[PDB]
Amino acid sequence: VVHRRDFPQDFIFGAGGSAYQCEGAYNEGNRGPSIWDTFTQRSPAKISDGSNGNQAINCYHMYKEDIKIMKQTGLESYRFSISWSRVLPGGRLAAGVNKDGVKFYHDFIDELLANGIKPSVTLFHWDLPQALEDEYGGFLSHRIVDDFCEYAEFCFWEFGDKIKYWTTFNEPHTFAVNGYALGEFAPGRGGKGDEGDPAIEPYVVTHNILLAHKAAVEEYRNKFQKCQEGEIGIVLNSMWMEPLSDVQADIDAQKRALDFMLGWFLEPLTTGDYPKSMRELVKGRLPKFSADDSEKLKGCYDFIGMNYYTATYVTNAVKSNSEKLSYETDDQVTKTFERNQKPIGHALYGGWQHVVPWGLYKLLVYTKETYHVPVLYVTESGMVEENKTKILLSEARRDAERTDYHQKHLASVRDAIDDGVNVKGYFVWSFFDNFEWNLGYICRYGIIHVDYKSFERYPKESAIWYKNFIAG
Amino acid sequence: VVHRRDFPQDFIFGAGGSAYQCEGAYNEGNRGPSIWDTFTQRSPAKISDGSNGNQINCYHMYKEDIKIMKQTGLESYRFSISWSRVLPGGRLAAGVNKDGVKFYHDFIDELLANGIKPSVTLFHWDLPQALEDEYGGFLSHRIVDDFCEYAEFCFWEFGDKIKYWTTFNEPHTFAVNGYALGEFAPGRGGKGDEGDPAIEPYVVTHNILLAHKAAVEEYRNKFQKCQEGEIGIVLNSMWMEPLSDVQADIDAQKRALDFMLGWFLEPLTTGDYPKSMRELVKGRLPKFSADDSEKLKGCYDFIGMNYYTATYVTNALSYETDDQVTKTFERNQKPIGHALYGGWQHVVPWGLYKLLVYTKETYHVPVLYVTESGMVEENKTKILLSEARRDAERTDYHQKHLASVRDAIDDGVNVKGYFVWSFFDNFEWNLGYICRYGIIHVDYKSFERYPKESAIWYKNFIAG
Amino acid sequence: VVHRRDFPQDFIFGAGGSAYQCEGAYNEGNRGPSIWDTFTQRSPAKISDGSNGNQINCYHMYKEDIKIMKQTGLESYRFSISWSRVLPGGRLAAGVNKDGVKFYHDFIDELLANGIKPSVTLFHWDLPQALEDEYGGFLSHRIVDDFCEYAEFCFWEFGDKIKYWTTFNEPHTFAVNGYALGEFAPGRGGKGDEGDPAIEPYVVTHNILLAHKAAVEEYRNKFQKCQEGEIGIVLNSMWMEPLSDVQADIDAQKRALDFMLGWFLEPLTTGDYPKSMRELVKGRLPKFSADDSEKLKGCYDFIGMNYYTATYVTNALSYETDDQVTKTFERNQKPIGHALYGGWQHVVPWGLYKLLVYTKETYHVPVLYVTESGMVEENKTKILLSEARRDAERTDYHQKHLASVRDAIDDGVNVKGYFVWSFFDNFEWNLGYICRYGIIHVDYKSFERYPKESAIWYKNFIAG
Ligand SMILES: CC[C@H]1[C@H](O[C@@H]2O[C@H](CO)[C@@H](O)[C@H](O)[C@H]2O)OC=C(C(=O)OC)[C@H]1C[C@@H]1NCCc2c1[nH]c1ccccc21
Numbered sequence A: 001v002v003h004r005r006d007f008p009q010d011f012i013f014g015a016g017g018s019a020y021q022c023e024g025a026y027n028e029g030n031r032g033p034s035i036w037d038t039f040t041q042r043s044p045a046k047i048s049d050g051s052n053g054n055q056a057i058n059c060y061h062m063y064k065e066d067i068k069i070m071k072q073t074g075l076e077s078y079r080f081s082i083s084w085s086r087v088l089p090g091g092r093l094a095a096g097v098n099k100d101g102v103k104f105y106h107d108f109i110d111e112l113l114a115n116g117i118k119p120s121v122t123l124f125h126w127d128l129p130q131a132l133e134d135e136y137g138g139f140l141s142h143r144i145v146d147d148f149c150e151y152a153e154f155c156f157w158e159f160g161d162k163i164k165y166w167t168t169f170n171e172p173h174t175f176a177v178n179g180y181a182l183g184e185f186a187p188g189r190g191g192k193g194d195e196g197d198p199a200i201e202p203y204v205v206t207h208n209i210l211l212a213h214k215a216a217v218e219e220y221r222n223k224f225q226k227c228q229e230g231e232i233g234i235v236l237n238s239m240w241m242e243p244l245s246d247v248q249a250d251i252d253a254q255k256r257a258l259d260f261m262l263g264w265f266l267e268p269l270t271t272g273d274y275p276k277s278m279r280e281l282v283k284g285r286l287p288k289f290s291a292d293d294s295e296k297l298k299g300c301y302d303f304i305g306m307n308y309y310t311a312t313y314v315t316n317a318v319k320s321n322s323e324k325l326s327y328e329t330d331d332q333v334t335k336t337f338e339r340n341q342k343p344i345g346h347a348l349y350g351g352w353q354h355v356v357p358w359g360l361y362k363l364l365v366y367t368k369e370t371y372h373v374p375v376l377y378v379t380e381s382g383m384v385e386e387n388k389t390k391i392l393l394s395e396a397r398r399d400a401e402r403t404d405y406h407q408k409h410l411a412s413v414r415d416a417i418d419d420g421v422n423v424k425g426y427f428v429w430s431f432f433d434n435f436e437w438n439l440g441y442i443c444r445y446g447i448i449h450v451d452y453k454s455f456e457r458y459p460k461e462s463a464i465w466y467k468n469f470i471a472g
Numbered sequence B, C: 001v002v003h004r005r006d007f008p009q010d011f012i013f014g015a016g017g018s019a020y021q022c023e024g025a026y027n028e029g030n031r032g033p034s035i036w037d038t039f040t041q042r043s044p045a046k047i048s049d050g051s052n053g054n055q056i057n058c059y060h061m062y063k064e065d066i067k068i069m070k071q072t073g074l075e076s077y078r079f080s081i082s083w084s085r086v087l088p089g090g091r092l093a094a095g096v097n098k099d100g101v102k103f104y105h106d107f108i109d110e111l112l113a114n115g116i117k118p119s120v121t122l123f124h125w126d127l128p129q130a131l132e133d134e135y136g137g138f139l140s141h142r143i144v145d146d147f148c149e150y151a152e153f154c155f156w157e158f159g160d161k162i163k164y165w166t167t168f169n170e171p172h173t174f175a176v177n178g179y180a181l182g183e184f185a186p187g188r189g190g191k192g193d194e195g196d197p198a199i200e201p202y203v204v205t206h207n208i209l210l211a212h213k214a215a216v217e218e219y220r221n222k223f224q225k226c227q228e229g230e231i232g233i234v235l236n237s238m239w240m241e242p243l244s245d246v247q248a249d250i251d252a253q254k255r256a257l258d259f260m261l262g263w264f265l266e267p268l269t270t271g272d273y274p275k276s277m278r279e280l281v282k283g284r285l286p287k288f289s290a291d292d293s294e295k296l297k298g299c300y301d302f303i304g305m306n307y308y309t310a311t312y313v314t315n316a317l318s319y320e321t322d323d324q325v326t327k328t329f330e331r332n333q334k335p336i337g338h339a340l341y342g343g344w345q346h347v348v349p350w351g352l353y354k355l356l357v358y359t360k361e362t363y364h365v366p367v368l369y370v371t372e373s374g375m376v377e378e379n380k381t382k383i384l385l386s387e388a389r390r391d392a393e394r395t396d397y398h399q400k401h402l403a404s405v406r407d408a409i410d411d412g413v414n415v416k417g418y419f420v421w422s423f424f425d426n427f428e429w430n431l432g433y434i435c436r437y438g439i440i441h442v443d444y445k446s447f448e449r450y451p452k453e454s455a456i457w458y459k460n461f462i463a464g
């Protein structure tokens, strides 16, 4: 029960992918290694099944086909990302610009347009050129901000004549928390036995991300927006934080959990400063913005993309022995999916995603309430699914649960727009089944089935549902 | 401690693969499905990791593979024609697929272009689906006659350039796991499955022998004179070591052997199945007509022999049970030999010795070759290529094994060939890709190919 | 006055190039950046004319180049594999780049297709960036083990067709200008630079020797038997002539030599560095474990030797200063020999003689080859090709030089090879393209290729 009609005339329906997870051909067409190759190649034991995005799902060879599948599905827009290191193999500009790479993107762009599909480019989705990570520590250094400027500029210039929707960072919260705190994702530092420092690094990284985002955005506003007629934003994520009980401790915990995952970023792009909740708890470990930075950061995005998966009960926690100072612990908030052994929502394959359609509602509404953002897009939305091998294609593709999941989720999204909040886009994650980072290929997210061996692609029932729904 | 020199001037050193396990491209170049596609597609829960021979892609990458062969220094490589790629529909009305017969010619010519001897197994379990379907495959005497046409087409098509032909690879396995255990294409007989494990295996091998016979006669009578080649059949057995020195155990080794090897050799010697089988299977073991018996006697040019391991044996309605012989790898909880990844393969270099010697003693065979020999290896994901390839244990494995093969030659038995199984890592049938057998590593995803230490060792050794 | 005949029947006449200086196409065919790209891109103010090895384009134009080689009559050509083109990411997890290994195979096959002997240096300073980056490159014992894998891949990949292997070209230079002078990739140690000129060079060459050792053992043990080739290492020195006949000057030549050549040879002889070095560098000169010392003794199949010039030498915290020996080209303001374009190269044909003789006398080496020999030439722009190519002085240069090499053979020393540096004019490292070394002129812009008189001379001379 929910149709195209209940959504604005101009609302955009879409799905996504991302270089590393899709393109494959890591070592073809002159592409320079990203930290994600290196992670997955030097540290394969940190991948659930030991795999890597070397071939991924081979979107780099098969684009013409994929865009076929897109149009069959009726996507209004697809969201993909440029592998930084495929346009600039060595990271900076001295290393040179790789012509094979820029052909691909152009070919790809032109193909989407040739099929009536709106291109939407994330600049950075964690596939940071190894070259840079290596030289100066990547985002551990303010050197990155400047190189990201060049990268951003090059792209806008090279391709921007034809894409009107730019994204700087995809889920920088994740990138830095999983990267420099959990040690679970490229470059894999901070976690135990790992090389970093989980008390310091995350905060440095995100500090620089915001500083890069800022330079990226300014570049575009001042030198390109006037002509290309486009919009840059940044897409962030959060779980919804539901107070476990109606006590103050929980109520406040929600604020800290929210601030520390979302505010961490939004607040700067709002006030010019980090959540006080964080300043309060993180103290000297949380870097300061120059007086100018603060101002230039205020309202410095054209839109916020928003990725939602799940919601957790939240509560203030007490430990304090074998606490190591770490970002993990700093938001003194214990999460749990259980109220009174009752889960918050049905528990999907991972053990982490729980279907909570209504968390998306609460979160969006929250983001208006607290961050008064002009333009909002649900940029990632979707359900995980175990990759059962030993079942026929005939079966795997009857993903009713996934149809349902997007129905319910769209229902909340409608309910958010209806109550004021200015959502303008739903983006199914993921268009195709792809490489699920540290989980490799043990699961699937897409509305188009992909055989991780043959690369063959068959549409799930969800895709079909969606084809009909996009067409009201 | 073992060198090239310890072996006859003429002894051949080689390695192998097998259509289904290698070629991939199941549905390209107009190939017709085999039972092994079907098995693996319709029944993928019977595969350890659910996978299939659909794609290690030797079908596209042959020119490269032959390079690697020649680097390794192989004197000969042993491959197999997918029956169903030259005759998509099984019989001759279905037609001859030109794309397929180009491949094999391209491939054979490539081998010879590089100094490598081609050696063609005709059947390695990828029977065309079309045939399995139409008349039950090897459960029908219809197969014998079509196998003859296949055989004949081939020899005619390619034989002007290959001098080593094999009819069946491991028919014992084919029939026992196929129609008894239900574990391999077409997957009948086993629990919940469709066949009958008391009947089918016997009918099946009874026809295979009848097929092999027709294949061989075709060859001797119409092709041997010209192509000056040699047809044989490759069989396999575990060595059977009596658990203790009592007669019950001694007689059990007789039964165990008869039931696994004699099942085939004895016909190809006396023209009749092992008395041990006749006595136990009685009426469920089909009879050979008077004529069949004679034409079957000494009806091979050589026996190939596949060895992997040996089991202690002792005294204990289906074929599994019919050789009333309990198998076990433990003496006094002592293993017979070191236990390789599977739980099944144990390194028993001296079982090859014992077995070869046995085959001379019992079946007086003119020419023998060790056509499959090699060690399994766990497909550990989560380790660097740098490591995976330091297969010390596999070098050792082949050393020890060649050590026993020398010893066999030295004591009369006429082995003329060692053949590493398998040249490349490939699709390990019902275990899919959770293990590896090869001297050349293969990335099951990228198809990329890097040589193991073992292959390097072998490169040196071939070169004495 | 000097002909072919004055030289052994078996003596090889050749010329050379070097990946970075020739191939160009730094970013095509999937090659991974070396430190020398990086150096030249991030640090182009350290290059005389600011240029880089990005593009003399031998990578596209090989077939042509091999023609020119064969016109010239070269018996063998000496090139180098860009480590970073077969292994883009340095180690094996980064993967093997097929495009690259096609090139070298295409290239090797081309040489042999034309009657020219292939001769592969493994390392000529284009270390993969990925490695330099990850663990400091040669400042870490990590390099030894990866160099082994590189070495091994190669021999395996191509070795079935090349019979002359070299581990390192001029490691002395690599380490001294690299980590002492800061003048060559990665450019550390020198004034304002990042290294330490008292420590690094010693650690670096200490590892190079450790690498060379591992490379060589790999070869002897696993490949020599088959490919029947030979691995060595190419070193270099100036000849050191005492300024006067006092002992201070005599002892200085000992130090000068030890510190430049002994630094390497002595380990590859006794298993230890020159006592002269041990005495002066003390604790900053790392020690070889008991095992390393033995496995290092006589650990080469031949020494290649690069000669350019000779310096008068005399008595005088960084390696430059540690051999307390002031160098000078002037006796009594008389130059040691005619002063070539740079200010550094002086024509001293007889220094090659002296040096070769010295190396026999001091390091008793089985086989020696003159692997690099040639004269620099100013890249005068503003003159016609007609003129540039009348390199009389370069003909003369090689004559005189071969004259001394003959004389060396004649007095016992076992030289087996003269190799003109450089076949083609190419990228002269930190001097970029402001000079030329070759017997084949190359238009640094158009890549066009016309042979100098020198090349013609050499064509005749090779042909006695
Ligand atoms: C079906 C393969 C049989 C195998 O046939 C050859 O095996 C190669 C690899 O095993 C294969 O590539 C080639 O095609 C064959 O010629 O050999 C014999 C078997 C057998 O059961 O007893 C003799 C079979 C294997 C044996 N079966 C019982 C348990 C088991 C076997 N092999 C492994 C390996 C790892 C774990 C368990 C096992």
Ligand SMILES: CC[C@H]1[C@H](O[C@@H]2O[C@H](CO)[C@@H](O)[C@H](O)[C@H]2O)OC=C(C(=O)OC)[C@H]1C[C@@H]1NCCc2c1[nH]c1ccccc21
Pocket: C018, C169, C170, C173, C177, C236, C237, C238, C306, C308, C341, C342, C343, C344, C345, C372, C376, C421, C422, C428, C429, C435, C437
């Ligand atoms: C770095 C090159 C060294 C060179 O190494 C070979 O040189 C070839 C050309 O010189 C080159 O193509 C090949 O790669 C090398 O095997 O030889 C030795 C040097 C040295 O400093 O003392 C021995 C080096 C050169 C020497 N360095 C000090 C000053 C100088 C040198 N060569 C010239 C040439 C012109 C002006 C100055 C100089």
